[PDB]
């Protein structure tokens, strides 16, 4: 009966370690 | 103050779910590095998280060249989907440079909205079989909802 928007759970920042390191 | 320090704040706010503050910080980074792909990607995520789907889509569509093959196809399709542009969302998914689990998740939802229930079921069976998260019971509920929608017709 319910249908979940599970795609919303995947809306997330990409990996940031390169930006944190100023690579 | 420095760009790497701003990124430190972006990460902290994002990890804590403060997309409002992350967005303010990301916008400061974009003032310094206007076509930073990672910053544009983060901005789009913040906007979606705060329900600004038109604004997020506008970021993507005004940076098409810069975002080539980091096209943000998932986010673009997601925004189109939330703006009830389901055919557009389908097209965006199908023309994505690289297929991913999140794209497949959205694809299942798009097919459900398009009432393409047979292919939808196949997508969800696949997602349940190959999952690595805590959402399998929710996916099974989606599977059951799809079959319920089909039952209406017989
Ligand atoms: Na789903």
JSON list of N, CA and C in Angstrom, two decimals, chain B residues 50-111:
[
{"chain": "B", "resi": 50, "resn": "UNK", "atom": "N", "xyz": [16.68, 20.65, 0.80]},
{"chain": "B", "resi": 50, "resn": "UNK", "atom": "CA", "xyz": [15.80, 21.70, 1.32]},
{"chain": "B", "resi": 50, "resn": "UNK", "atom": "C", "xyz": [14.55, 21.92, 0.47]},
{"chain": "B", "resi": 51, "resn": "UNK", "atom": "N", "xyz": [14.31, 21.02, -0.48]},
{"chain": "B", "resi": 51, "resn": "UNK", "atom": "CA", "xyz": [13.09, 21.04, -1.30]},
{"chain": "B", "resi": 51, "resn": "UNK", "atom": "C", "xyz": [13.07, 22.07, -2.42]},
{"chain": "B", "resi": 52, "resn": "UNK", "atom": "N", "xyz": [14.23, 22.61, -2.77]},
{"chain": "B", "resi": 52, "resn": "UNK", "atom": "CA", "xyz": [14.35, 23.60, -3.85]},
{"chain": "B", "resi": 52, "resn": "UNK", "atom": "C", "xyz": [14.70, 22.92, -5.17]},
{"chain": "B", "resi": 53, "resn": "UNK", "atom": "N", "xyz": [13.74, 22.17, -5.71]},
{"chain": "B", "resi": 53, "resn": "UNK", "atom": "CA", "xyz": [14.01, 21.33, -6.88]},
{"chain": "B", "resi": 53, "resn": "UNK", "atom": "C", "xyz": [14.21, 22.14, -8.15]},
{"chain": "B", "resi": 54, "resn": "UNK", "atom": "N", "xyz": [13.42, 23.19, -8.34]},
{"chain": "B", "resi": 54, "resn": "UNK", "atom": "CA", "xyz": [13.58, 24.08, -9.50]},
{"chain": "B", "resi": 54, "resn": "UNK", "atom": "C", "xyz": [14.96, 24.74, -9.50]},
{"chain": "B", "resi": 55, "resn": "UNK", "atom": "N", "xyz": [15.36, 25.28, -8.34]},
{"chain": "B", "resi": 55, "resn": "UNK", "atom": "CA", "xyz": [16.66, 25.92, -8.21]},
{"chain": "B", "resi": 55, "resn": "UNK", "atom": "C", "xyz": [17.80, 24.94, -8.45]},
{"chain": "B", "resi": 56, "resn": "UNK", "atom": "N", "xyz": [17.70, 23.73, -7.88]},
{"chain": "B", "resi": 56, "resn": "UNK", "atom": "CA", "xyz": [18.71, 22.69, -8.12]},
{"chain": "B", "resi": 56, "resn": "UNK", "atom": "C", "xyz": [18.84, 22.34, -9.60]},
{"chain": "B", "resi": 57, "resn": "UNK", "atom": "N", "xyz": [17.69, 22.17, -10.26]},
{"chain": "B", "resi": 57, "resn": "UNK", "atom": "CA", "xyz": [17.67, 21.83, -11.68]},
{"chain": "B", "resi": 57, "resn": "UNK", "atom": "C", "xyz": [18.30, 22.95, -12.52]},
{"chain": "B", "resi": 58, "resn": "UNK", "atom": "N", "xyz": [18.03, 24.19, -12.12]},
{"chain": "B", "resi": 58, "resn": "UNK", "atom": "CA", "xyz": [18.59, 25.38, -12.77]},
{"chain": "B", "resi": 58, "resn": "UNK", "atom": "C", "xyz": [20.12, 25.44, -12.66]},
{"chain": "B", "resi": 59, "resn": "UNK", "atom": "N", "xyz": [20.66, 25.08, -11.49]},
{"chain": "B", "resi": 59, "resn": "UNK", "atom": "CA", "xyz": [22.11, 24.96, -11.33]},
{"chain": "B", "resi": 59, "resn": "UNK", "atom": "C", "xyz": [22.68, 23.98, -12.36]},
{"chain": "B", "resi": 60, "resn": "UNK", "atom": "N", "xyz": [22.04, 22.82, -12.50]},
{"chain": "B", "resi": 60, "resn": "UNK", "atom": "CA", "xyz": [22.54, 21.78, -13.41]},
{"chain": "B", "resi": 60, "resn": "UNK", "atom": "C", "xyz": [22.46, 22.25, -14.86]},
{"chain": "B", "resi": 61, "resn": "UNK", "atom": "N", "xyz": [21.32, 22.83, -15.23]},
{"chain": "B", "resi": 61, "resn": "UNK", "atom": "CA", "xyz": [21.04, 23.17, -16.62]},
{"chain": "B", "resi": 61, "resn": "UNK", "atom": "C", "xyz": [21.78, 24.41, -17.12]},
{"chain": "B", "resi": 62, "resn": "UNK", "atom": "N", "xyz": [22.27, 25.23, -16.19]},
{"chain": "B", "resi": 62, "resn": "UNK", "atom": "CA", "xyz": [23.10, 26.39, -16.54]},
{"chain": "B", "resi": 62, "resn": "UNK", "atom": "C", "xyz": [24.61, 26.10, -16.45]},
{"chain": "B", "resi": 63, "resn": "UNK", "atom": "N", "xyz": [24.97, 24.85, -16.14]},
{"chain": "B", "resi": 63, "resn": "UNK", "atom": "CA", "xyz": [26.37, 24.43, -16.08]},
{"chain": "B", "resi": 63, "resn": "UNK", "atom": "C", "xyz": [26.62, 23.16, -16.85]},
{"chain": "B", "resi": 64, "resn": "UNK", "atom": "N", "xyz": [25.87, 22.97, -17.93]},
{"chain": "B", "resi": 64, "resn": "UNK", "atom": "CA", "xyz": [25.90, 21.72, -18.71]},
{"chain": "B", "resi": 64, "resn": "UNK", "atom": "C", "xyz": [27.30, 21.32, -19.18]},
{"chain": "B", "resi": 65, "resn": "UNK", "atom": "N", "xyz": [28.03, 22.26, -19.77]},
{"chain": "B", "resi": 65, "resn": "UNK", "atom": "CA", "xyz": [29.38, 21.99, -20.29]},
{"chain": "B", "resi": 65, "resn": "UNK", "atom": "C", "xyz": [30.35, 21.60, -19.17]},
{"chain": "B", "resi": 66, "resn": "UNK", "atom": "N", "xyz": [30.38, 22.41, -18.11]},
{"chain": "B", "resi": 66, "resn": "UNK", "atom": "CA", "xyz": [31.22, 22.16, -16.93]},
{"chain": "B", "resi": 66, "resn": "UNK", "atom": "C", "xyz": [30.92, 20.80, -16.29]},
{"chain": "B", "resi": 67, "resn": "UNK", "atom": "N", "xyz": [29.65, 20.41, -16.29]},
{"chain": "B", "resi": 67, "resn": "UNK", "atom": "CA", "xyz": [29.23, 19.15, -15.68]},
{"chain": "B", "resi": 67, "resn": "UNK", "atom": "C", "xyz": [29.20, 17.96, -16.65]},
{"chain": "B", "resi": 68, "resn": "UNK", "atom": "N", "xyz": [29.85, 18.09, -17.81]},
{"chain": "B", "resi": 68, "resn": "UNK", "atom": "CA", "xyz": [29.89, 17.00, -18.79]},
{"chain": "B", "resi": 68, "resn": "UNK", "atom": "C", "xyz": [30.60, 15.75, -18.26]},
{"chain": "B", "resi": 69, "resn": "UNK", "atom": "N", "xyz": [29.88, 14.62, -18.28]},
{"chain": "B", "resi": 69, "resn": "UNK", "atom": "CA", "xyz": [30.37, 13.32, -17.76]},
{"chain": "B", "resi": 69, "resn": "UNK", "atom": "C", "xyz": [30.64, 13.28, -16.25]},
{"chain": "B", "resi": 70, "resn": "UNK", "atom": "N", "xyz": [30.21, 14.34, -15.58]},
{"chain": "B", "resi": 70, "resn": "UNK", "atom": "CA", "xyz": [29.88, 14.36, -14.17]},
{"chain": "B", "resi": 70, "resn": "UNK", "atom": "C", "xyz": [28.54, 15.07, -14.21]},
{"chain": "B", "resi": 71, "resn": "UNK", "atom": "N", "xyz": [27.73, 14.65, -15.18]},
{"chain": "B", "resi": 71, "resn": "UNK", "atom": "CA", "xyz": [26.53, 15.38, -15.59]},
{"chain": "B", "resi": 71, "resn": "UNK", "atom": "C", "xyz": [25.52, 15.57, -14.48]},
{"chain": "B", "resi": 72, "resn": "UNK", "atom": "N", "xyz": [25.76, 14.92, -13.35]},
{"chain": "B", "resi": 72, "resn": "UNK", "atom": "CA", "xyz": [24.79, 14.93, -12.27]},
{"chain": "B", "resi": 72, "resn": "UNK", "atom": "C", "xyz": [23.46, 14.37, -12.76]},
{"chain": "B", "resi": 73, "resn": "UNK", "atom": "N", "xyz": [23.50, 13.27, -13.52]},
{"chain": "B", "resi": 73, "resn": "UNK", "atom": "CA", "xyz": [22.27, 12.75, -14.12]},
{"chain": "B", "resi": 73, "resn": "UNK", "atom": "C", "xyz": [21.28, 12.29, -13.07]},
{"chain": "B", "resi": 74, "resn": "UNK", "atom": "N", "xyz": [21.78, 11.67, -12.00]},
{"chain": "B", "resi": 74, "resn": "UNK", "atom": "CA", "xyz": [20.89, 11.24, -10.91]},
{"chain": "B", "resi": 74, "resn": "UNK", "atom": "C", "xyz": [20.13, 12.42, -10.33]},
{"chain": "B", "resi": 75, "resn": "UNK", "atom": "N", "xyz": [20.86, 13.48, -9.95]},
{"chain": "B", "resi": 75, "resn": "UNK", "atom": "CA", "xyz": [20.23, 14.66, -9.36]},
{"chain": "B", "resi": 75, "resn": "UNK", "atom": "C", "xyz": [19.30, 15.38, -10.34]},
{"chain": "B", "resi": 76, "resn": "UNK", "atom": "N", "xyz": [19.71, 15.47, -11.60]},
{"chain": "B", "resi": 76, "resn": "UNK", "atom": "CA", "xyz": [18.86, 16.08, -12.63]},
{"chain": "B", "resi": 76, "resn": "UNK", "atom": "C", "xyz": [17.55, 15.31, -12.76]},
{"chain": "B", "resi": 77, "resn": "UNK", "atom": "N", "xyz": [17.66, 13.99, -12.92]},
{"chain": "B", "resi": 77, "resn": "UNK", "atom": "CA", "xyz": [16.47, 13.12, -13.02]},
{"chain": "B", "resi": 77, "resn": "UNK", "atom": "C", "xyz": [15.63, 13.19, -11.76]},
{"chain": "B", "resi": 78, "resn": "UNK", "atom": "N", "xyz": [16.29, 13.24, -10.60]},
{"chain": "B", "resi": 78, "resn": "UNK", "atom": "CA", "xyz": [15.56, 13.33, -9.34]},
{"chain": "B", "resi": 78, "resn": "UNK", "atom": "C", "xyz": [14.70, 14.60, -9.26]},
{"chain": "B", "resi": 79, "resn": "UNK", "atom": "N", "xyz": [15.28, 15.74, -9.65]},
{"chain": "B", "resi": 79, "resn": "UNK", "atom": "CA", "xyz": [14.57, 17.01, -9.66]},
{"chain": "B", "resi": 79, "resn": "UNK", "atom": "C", "xyz": [13.39, 16.97, -10.62]},
{"chain": "B", "resi": 80, "resn": "UNK", "atom": "N", "xyz": [13.62, 16.43, -11.81]},
{"chain": "B", "resi": 80, "resn": "UNK", "atom": "CA", "xyz": [12.55, 16.32, -12.82]},
{"chain": "B", "resi": 80, "resn": "UNK", "atom": "C", "xyz": [11.41, 15.46, -12.28]},
{"chain": "B", "resi": 81, "resn": "UNK", "atom": "N", "xyz": [11.77, 14.34, -11.67]},
{"chain": "B", "resi": 81, "resn": "UNK", "atom": "CA", "xyz": [10.82, 13.45, -11.02]},
{"chain": "B", "resi": 81, "resn": "UNK", "atom": "C", "xyz": [9.98, 14.18, -9.95]},
{"chain": "B", "resi": 82, "resn": "UNK", "atom": "N", "xyz": [10.64, 14.94, -9.08]},
{"chain": "B", "resi": 82, "resn": "UNK", "atom": "CA", "xyz": [9.93, 15.68, -8.03]},
{"chain": "B", "resi": 82, "resn": "UNK", "atom": "C", "xyz": [9.09, 16.84, -8.57]},
{"chain": "B", "resi": 83, "resn": "UNK", "atom": "N", "xyz": [9.45, 17.32, -9.76]},
{"chain": "B", "resi": 83, "resn": "UNK", "atom": "CA", "xyz": [8.68, 18.38, -10.42]},
{"chain": "B", "resi": 83, "resn": "UNK", "atom": "C", "xyz": [7.59, 17.81, -11.34]},
{"chain": "B", "resi": 84, "resn": "UNK", "atom": "N", "xyz": [7.34, 16.51, -11.19]},
{"chain": "B", "resi": 84, "resn": "UNK", "atom": "CA", "xyz": [6.33, 15.77, -11.97]},
{"chain": "B", "resi": 84, "resn": "UNK", "atom": "C", "xyz": [6.59, 15.75, -13.49]},
{"chain": "B", "resi": 85, "resn": "UNK", "atom": "N", "xyz": [7.86, 15.91, -13.87]},
{"chain": "B", "resi": 85, "resn": "UNK", "atom": "CA", "xyz": [8.28, 15.80, -15.26]},
{"chain": "B", "resi": 85, "resn": "UNK", "atom": "C", "xyz": [8.84, 14.39, -15.48]},
{"chain": "B", "resi": 86, "resn": "UNK", "atom": "N", "xyz": [7.94, 13.41, -15.48]},
{"chain": "B", "resi": 86, "resn": "UNK", "atom": "CA", "xyz": [8.33, 12.00, -15.39]},
{"chain": "B", "resi": 86, "resn": "UNK", "atom": "C", "xyz": [9.01, 11.50, -16.66]},
{"chain": "B", "resi": 87, "resn": "UNK", "atom": "N", "xyz": [8.49, 11.92, -17.82]},
{"chain": "B", "resi": 87, "resn": "UNK", "atom": "CA", "xyz": [9.09, 11.56, -19.10]},
{"chain": "B", "resi": 87, "resn": "UNK", "atom": "C", "xyz": [10.51, 12.11, -19.22]},
{"chain": "B", "resi": 88, "resn": "UNK", "atom": "N", "xyz": [10.69, 13.38, -18.83]},
{"chain": "B", "resi": 88, "resn": "UNK", "atom": "CA", "xyz": [12.02, 14.00, -18.76]},
{"chain": "B", "resi": 88, "resn": "UNK", "atom": "C", "xyz": [12.95, 13.20, -17.84]},
{"chain": "B", "resi": 89, "resn": "UNK", "atom": "N", "xyz": [12.45, 12.83, -16.66]},
{"chain": "B", "resi": 89, "resn": "UNK", "atom": "CA", "xyz": [13.25, 12.05, -15.71]},
{"chain": "B", "resi": 89, "resn": "UNK", "atom": "C", "xyz": [13.70, 10.73, -16.33]},
{"chain": "B", "resi": 90, "resn": "UNK", "atom": "N", "xyz": [12.78, 10.05, -17.02]},
{"chain": "B", "resi": 90, "resn": "UNK", "atom": "CA", "xyz": [13.10, 8.82, -17.73]},
{"chain": "B", "resi": 90, "resn": "UNK", "atom": "C", "xyz": [14.23, 9.03, -18.75]},
{"chain": "B", "resi": 91, "resn": "UNK", "atom": "N", "xyz": [14.10, 10.09, -19.55]},
{"chain": "B", "resi": 91, "resn": "UNK", "atom": "CA", "xyz": [15.08, 10.41, -20.61]},
{"chain": "B", "resi": 91, "resn": "UNK", "atom": "C", "xyz": [16.46, 10.67, -20.01]},
{"chain": "B", "resi": 92, "resn": "UNK", "atom": "N", "xyz": [16.48, 11.45, -18.93]},
{"chain": "B", "resi": 92, "resn": "UNK", "atom": "CA", "xyz": [17.72, 11.76, -18.22]},
{"chain": "B", "resi": 92, "resn": "UNK", "atom": "C", "xyz": [18.41, 10.49, -17.71]},
{"chain": "B", "resi": 93, "resn": "UNK", "atom": "N", "xyz": [17.64, 9.60, -17.08]},
{"chain": "B", "resi": 93, "resn": "UNK", "atom": "CA", "xyz": [18.18, 8.33, -16.61]},
{"chain": "B", "resi": 93, "resn": "UNK", "atom": "C", "xyz": [18.76, 7.48, -17.76]},
{"chain": "B", "resi": 94, "resn": "UNK", "atom": "N", "xyz": [18.00, 7.34, -18.84]},
{"chain": "B", "resi": 94, "resn": "UNK", "atom": "CA", "xyz": [18.41, 6.50, -19.96]},
{"chain": "B", "resi": 94, "resn": "UNK", "atom": "C", "xyz": [19.67, 7.00, -20.67]},
{"chain": "B", "resi": 95, "resn": "UNK", "atom": "N", "xyz": [19.86, 8.31, -20.68]},
{"chain": "B", "resi": 95, "resn": "UNK", "atom": "CA", "xyz": [21.00, 8.91, -21.37]},
{"chain": "B", "resi": 95, "resn": "UNK", "atom": "C", "xyz": [22.21, 9.20, -20.46]},
{"chain": "B", "resi": 96, "resn": "UNK", "atom": "N", "xyz": [22.16, 8.72, -19.22]},
{"chain": "B", "resi": 96, "resn": "UNK", "atom": "CA", "xyz": [23.27, 8.90, -18.27]},
{"chain": "B", "resi": 96, "resn": "UNK", "atom": "C", "xyz": [24.55, 8.23, -18.75]},
{"chain": "B", "resi": 97, "resn": "UNK", "atom": "N", "xyz": [25.68, 8.91, -18.57]},
{"chain": "B", "resi": 97, "resn": "UNK", "atom": "CA", "xyz": [26.98, 8.40, -18.99]},
{"chain": "B", "resi": 97, "resn": "UNK", "atom": "C", "xyz": [27.39, 7.13, -18.26]},
{"chain": "B", "resi": 98, "resn": "UNK", "atom": "N", "xyz": [27.07, 7.06, -16.97]},
{"chain": "B", "resi": 98, "resn": "UNK", "atom": "CA", "xyz": [27.41, 5.93, -16.13]},
{"chain": "B", "resi": 98, "resn": "UNK", "atom": "C", "xyz": [26.20, 5.52, -15.29]},
{"chain": "B", "resi": 99, "resn": "UNK", "atom": "N", "xyz": [25.85, 4.24, -15.34]},
{"chain": "B", "resi": 99, "resn": "UNK", "atom": "CA", "xyz": [24.76, 3.71, -14.53]},
{"chain": "B", "resi": 99, "resn": "UNK", "atom": "C", "xyz": [25.25, 3.39, -13.12]},
{"chain": "B", "resi": 100, "resn": "UNK", "atom": "N", "xyz": [24.39, 3.62, -12.13]},
{"chain": "B", "resi": 100, "resn": "UNK", "atom": "CA", "xyz": [24.73, 3.44, -10.72]},
{"chain": "B", "resi": 100, "resn": "UNK", "atom": "C", "xyz": [23.52, 2.88, -9.98]},
{"chain": "B", "resi": 101, "resn": "UNK", "atom": "N", "xyz": [23.76, 2.41, -8.75]},
{"chain": "B", "resi": 101, "resn": "UNK", "atom": "CA", "xyz": [22.68, 1.94, -7.87]},
{"chain": "B", "resi": 101, "resn": "UNK", "atom": "C", "xyz": [21.63, 3.01, -7.58]},
{"chain": "B", "resi": 102, "resn": "UNK", "atom": "N", "xyz": [22.05, 4.25, -7.34]},
{"chain": "B", "resi": 102, "resn": "UNK", "atom": "CA", "xyz": [21.07, 5.31, -7.07]},
{"chain": "B", "resi": 102, "resn": "UNK", "atom": "C", "xyz": [20.22, 5.63, -8.32]},
{"chain": "B", "resi": 103, "resn": "UNK", "atom": "N", "xyz": [20.84, 5.59, -9.49]},
{"chain": "B", "resi": 103, "resn": "UNK", "atom": "CA", "xyz": [20.09, 5.75, -10.75]},
{"chain": "B", "resi": 103, "resn": "UNK", "atom": "C", "xyz": [19.05, 4.64, -10.92]},
{"chain": "B", "resi": 104, "resn": "UNK", "atom": "N", "xyz": [19.44, 3.41, -10.64]},
{"chain": "B", "resi": 104, "resn": "UNK", "atom": "CA", "xyz": [18.54, 2.25, -10.71]},
{"chain": "B", "resi": 104, "resn": "UNK", "atom": "C", "xyz": [17.39, 2.37, -9.71]},
{"chain": "B", "resi": 105, "resn": "UNK", "atom": "N", "xyz": [17.69, 2.86, -8.51]},
{"chain": "B", "resi": 105, "resn": "UNK", "atom": "CA", "xyz": [16.66, 3.09, -7.49]},
{"chain": "B", "resi": 105, "resn": "UNK", "atom": "C", "xyz": [15.61, 4.08, -8.02]},
{"chain": "B", "resi": 106, "resn": "UNK", "atom": "N", "xyz": [16.08, 5.20, -8.56]},
{"chain": "B", "resi": 106, "resn": "UNK", "atom": "CA", "xyz": [15.18, 6.21, -9.10]},
{"chain": "B", "resi": 106, "resn": "UNK", "atom": "C", "xyz": [14.41, 5.66, -10.31]},
{"chain": "B", "resi": 107, "resn": "UNK", "atom": "N", "xyz": [15.10, 4.88, -11.14]},
{"chain": "B", "resi": 107, "resn": "UNK", "atom": "CA", "xyz": [14.49, 4.25, -12.32]},
{"chain": "B", "resi": 107, "resn": "UNK", "atom": "C", "xyz": [13.29, 3.40, -11.92]},
{"chain": "B", "resi": 108, "resn": "UNK", "atom": "N", "xyz": [13.43, 2.60, -10.87]},
{"chain": "B", "resi": 108, "resn": "UNK", "atom": "CA", "xyz": [12.30, 1.85, -10.32]},
{"chain": "B", "resi": 108, "resn": "UNK", "atom": "C", "xyz": [11.12, 2.73, -9.98]},
{"chain": "B", "resi": 109, "resn": "UNK", "atom": "N", "xyz": [11.40, 3.88, -9.35]},
{"chain": "B", "resi": 109, "resn": "UNK", "atom": "CA", "xyz": [10.34, 4.81, -8.96]},
{"chain": "B", "resi": 109, "resn": "UNK", "atom": "C", "xyz": [9.69, 5.48, -10.17]},
{"chain": "B", "resi": 110, "resn": "UNK", "atom": "N", "xyz": [10.51, 5.82, -11.15]},
{"chain": "B", "resi": 110, "resn": "UNK", "atom": "CA", "xyz": [10.03, 6.42, -12.41]},
{"chain": "B", "resi": 110, "resn": "UNK", "atom": "C", "xyz": [9.11, 5.44, -13.15]},
{"chain": "B", "resi": 111, "resn": "UNK", "atom": "N", "xyz": [9.53, 4.18, -13.23]},
{"chain": "B", "resi": 111, "resn": "UNK", "atom": "CA", "xyz": [8.71, 3.16, -13.90]},
{"chain": "B", "resi": 111, "resn": "UNK", "atom": "C", "xyz": [7.38, 2.96, -13.19]}
]
